[PDB]
Design a protein around this ligand. Structure first.
Ligand SMILES: CCCCCCCCCCCCCC(=O)O
Ligand SMILES: CCCCCCCCCCCCCC(=O)O
Ligand SMILES: CCCCCCCCCCCCCC(=O)O
Ligand SMILES: CCCCCCCCCCCCCC(=O)O
Ligand SMILES: CCCCCCCCCCCCCC(=O)O
Ligand SMILES: CCCCCCCCCCCCCC(=O)O
Length: 581
């Protein structure tokens, strides 16, 4: 209406408004202390309240962009602290708003956020919950200036619920620590996924994004007509292009408009939206993004008629190649919620290659009549990989599955540093836990969602400090080919075994005292180094050295003496292992 700030305060409600304002300033003024942000917030909040009381009071008709910038240019130390950013204050809107956007700092050189002790946290939570919660909201927002503000707020609400539940339990730490591990891991994943999609959009362009979305949205909304999916993809692409440009309010507005459009047209989109569409503005787009797949239409034909049989395949294709290809994707994806989106794209791309050849030929129908046979192998390759890995997981359990992976990936790419091997194998292991639990029909999507980030973090680590041609080869492939390429890496037979180091395989009795998580990391570090030193060792030779170690550890950790048993028996295990391998 007349006052943007007032309209945002009425839609969001006071609590949400204050938190979002905190996150928004935090992400720009990343070196200002917490107490200075409490001050901005209270100042922006009292102003907003005067506009609620009276839409036409002084300054209430300014744009939110204008007010945000004005507030930013009001910080006294802005030049001293942020430098270039203060020169934005000399510009007029809209140039000013675009100048602020260029001058966020992505790596503010801030010490990492240490998780205090449980009783320290729960005491702070009891004494000043709002301070505890917003001080940490500030610390996270300042460290992740591109984390979509409303999503960060959603996380904060889950942290609050976990403190609320767990700080009253019998065993506080056993309740809370798993929840914070889970929240940290989801927050880190959500953050890398937001960054990867914007990098993808720029790298692979808008067509590939649109392909990706058609497939994802047809799986979610299989009852929708194609033209509806297509409308939603066009808008989704807009949203995501604006969101990647980094202006939070424009992003939020475009997301809200789309959410509104979907809710006003549920009957044309999906039967699963009722609940999301009843929620308030703030939660609506987020709830829509998480909704489960609608049940597909009861009795659907095979895609044979429209895409192989029908005489107007080549004619329908040449007329609008991407509409046609998109229709194929839609039809394939709606009947296959059980595939990864990239599988579906491999498929679509196979059908594209095939129409480009076959529509150029004398009898098109006969050239391409067997195109669906070429999909069988593509579909089976990830299905088999899921079978093999989830069966191997069941008989081994998370920890020893990771170890199976260590051995396997270290023999594949032994040039990779031991810490990157450990972390990536530990992580792949967790993707095996999370996703081999799901029923068959959600396994491949799950694994996709999670491998995409585990693999992109492996690549970014590695392209910022490189070691293996192959790894680079797979990381600079198409994003459809990324995972298959990694899967095809073979044991490196041109690797020169790493020279023995005494210390690497020396263990002191502190390891009997380390936490579960840390003792595994120490063991897994040694396993990697063991495989680096003797790459030729077989699975049974390695199991003999590993089961020898398993009996070395526990038969010096319950003993009348400790660090002697580790010094003296640890000479015996090492020389016996060197001889055996
Ligand atoms: C966006 C969340 C705002 C509130 C977070 C409150 C709890 C902070 C817990 C301590 C830091 C956690 C780091 C970690 O989980 O490893
Ligand atoms: C004075 C500065 C105010 C900054 C407040 C930021 C408000 C973000 C609005 C988010 C609304 C949710 C829309 C959505 O993501 O669907
Ligand atoms: C009006 C166009 C809106 C977007 C929906 C139809 C076109 C989407 C692109 C589909 C092409 C991808 C095929 C492929 O390369 O695998
Ligand atoms: C070693 C980690 C095992 C994780 C669970 C199995 C996942 C197998 C790969 C399937 C990935 C689907 C993405 C794709 O289609 O390329
Ligand atoms: C340094 C670690 C590089 C190796 C990690 C590649 C894992 C990606 C594929 C995971 C699922 C398939 C298992 C496989 O075939 O290897
Ligand atoms: C060349 C000296 C080799 C000495 C023995 C090193 C063994 C290190 C890896 C042990 C990991 C065992 C994991 C387990 O099954 O508990």
């Amino acid at each position: 209406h007349k006052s943007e700030v007032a309209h945002r305060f009425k839609d969001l409600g006071e609590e949400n408004f204050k938190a979002l304002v905190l996150i928004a300033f935090a992400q720009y003024l990343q070196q200002c202390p917490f107490e200075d942000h409490v001050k901005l917030v209270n100042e922006v909040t009292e102003f907003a309240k005067t506009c609620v009381a009276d839409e036409s009071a002084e300054n209430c008709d300014k744009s939110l962009h204008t007010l945000f910038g004005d507030k930013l240019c009001t910080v006294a130390t802005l030049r001293e602290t942020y430098g270039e950013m203060a020169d934005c204050c000399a510009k007029q809107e809209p140039e000013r708003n675009e100048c602020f956007l260029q001058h966020k700092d992505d790596n503010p050189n801030l010490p990492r956020l240490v998780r205090p002790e449980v009783d320290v946290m729960c005491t702070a939570f009891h004494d000043n919950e709002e301070t505890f919660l917003k001080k940490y909201l500030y610390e996270i927002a300042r460290r992740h200036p591109y984390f979509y503000a409303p999503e960060l707020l959603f996380f904060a609400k889950r942290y609050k619920a976990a403190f609320t539940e767990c700080c009253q339990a019998a065993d506080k730490a056993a309740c809370l620590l798993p929840k914070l591990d889970e929240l940290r891991d989801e927050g880190k994943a959500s953050s890398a996924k937001q960054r990867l999609k914007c990098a993808s959009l720029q790298k692979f362009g808008e067509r590939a994004f649109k392909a990706w979305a058609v497939a994802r949205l047809s799986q979610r909304f299989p009852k929708a007509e194609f033209a509806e999916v297509s409308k939603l993809v066009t808008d989704l692409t807009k949203v995501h292009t604006e969101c990647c440009h980094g202006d939070l309010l424009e992003c939020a507005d475009d997301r809200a408009d789309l959410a509104k459009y979907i809710c006003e047209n549920q009957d044309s989109i999906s039967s699963k939206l009722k609940e999301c569409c009843e929620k308030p503005l703030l939660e609506k787009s987020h709830c829509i993004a998480e909704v489960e797949n609608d049940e597909m239409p009861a009795d659907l034909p095979s895609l044979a008629a429209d895409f192989v049989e029908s005489k107007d395949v080549c004619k329908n294709y040449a007329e609008a190649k991407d509409v046609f290809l998109g229709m194929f994707l839609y039809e394939y994806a709606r009947r296959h919620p059980d595939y990864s989106v990239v599988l579906l794209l491999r498929l679509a791309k196979t059908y594209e290659t095939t129409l480009e050849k076959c529509c150029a030929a004398a009898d098109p129908h006969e050239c391409y009549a067997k195109v669906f046979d070429e999909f069988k192998p593509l579909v089976e390759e990830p299905q088999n990989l899921i079978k093999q890995n989830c069966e191997l997981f069941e008989q081994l359990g998370e920890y020893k599955f990771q170890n199976a992976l260590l051995v396997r990936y270290t023999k594949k790419v032994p040039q990779v540093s031991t810490p990157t091997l450990v972390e990536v194998s530990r992580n792949l292991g967790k993707v095996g836990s999370k996703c081999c639990k799901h029923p068959e029909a959600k396994r491949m999507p799950c694994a996709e969602d999670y491998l995409s980030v585990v693999l992109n973090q492996l690549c970014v680590l590695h392209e910022k400090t490189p070691v293996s041609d192959r790894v680079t080869k797979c990381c600079t492939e198409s994003l459809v080919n990324r995972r298959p390429c990694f899967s095809a890496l073979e044991v490196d037979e041109t690797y020169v075994p790493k020279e023995f180091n005494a210390e690497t395989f020396t263990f002191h009795a502190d390891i009997c005292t380390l936490s579960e998580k840390e003792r595994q990391i120490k063991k897994q570090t040694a396993l990697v180094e063991l495989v680096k030193h003797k790459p030729k060792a077989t699975k049974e030779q390695l199991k003999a050295v590993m089961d020898d170690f398993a009996a070395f550890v526990e038969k010096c950790c319950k003993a009348d003496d400790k660090e002697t048993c580790f010094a003296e028996e640890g000479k015996k295990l090492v020389a016996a292992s060197q001889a055996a391998l």
